[PDB]
């Protein structure tokens, strides 16, 4: 874990083109966005980083846009029920 950049995927979509699916007809190897938090070592930001999605095969990354934290921890003390969040 601490020499490997991994990530559990809590959100998944295909950002393919539905009229391209209407053209070719559902056989298409289609592109996919995978959203989640990442653990371990820092995963590099250049495209082309090889990645094993554990159960579907080996791929390489195409583009990474990091997003603001959907479930952040807020800045003796106690934890406010306002700040007990859930994602």
């Amino acid at each position: 874990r601490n020499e490997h950049p991994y990530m559990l995927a809590d959100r998944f979509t295909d950002l393919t083109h539905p009229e391209l699916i209407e053209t070719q007809g559902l056989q298409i190897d289609r592109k996919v966005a995978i959203y989640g938090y990442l653990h371990g070592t820092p995963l590099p930001s250049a495209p082309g980083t090889r990645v094993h999605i554990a159960g579907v095969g080996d791929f390489s990354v195409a583009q990474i846009e990091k997003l603001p934290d959907p479930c952040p921890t807020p800045f003796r003390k106690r934890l406010d029920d306002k700040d007990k969040l859930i994602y």
Partner: protein
């Protein structure tokens, strides 16, 4: 008590390795609920997230990340 102090101070020593986990914004710790089919799990994940976030999370699916501390948040999956 000196022999006790030596033999207890010895078992603090471990293999010095790197950490590679940040201290500013660490990721949510992955909590995996593992059981044979027919015990706990769902009921347990529901009960823990209801106690933690005051929100009845009926019909779970996928990983569920909640904040459970001032700096410790954690991800529930089954």
């Amino acid at each position: 008590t000196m022999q006790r102090s030596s033999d207890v101070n010895e078992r603090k020593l471990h293999v010095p390795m790197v950490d590679r986990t940040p201290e500013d914004d660490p990721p949510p710790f992955i909590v995996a609920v593992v059981g044979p089919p027919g015990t706990g799990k769902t009921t347990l994940i529901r009960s823990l997230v209801r106690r933690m976030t005051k929100s009845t999370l009926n019909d779970i699916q996928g990983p569920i990340t909640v904040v459970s501390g001032k700096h410790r948040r954690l991800t529930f999956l089954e």
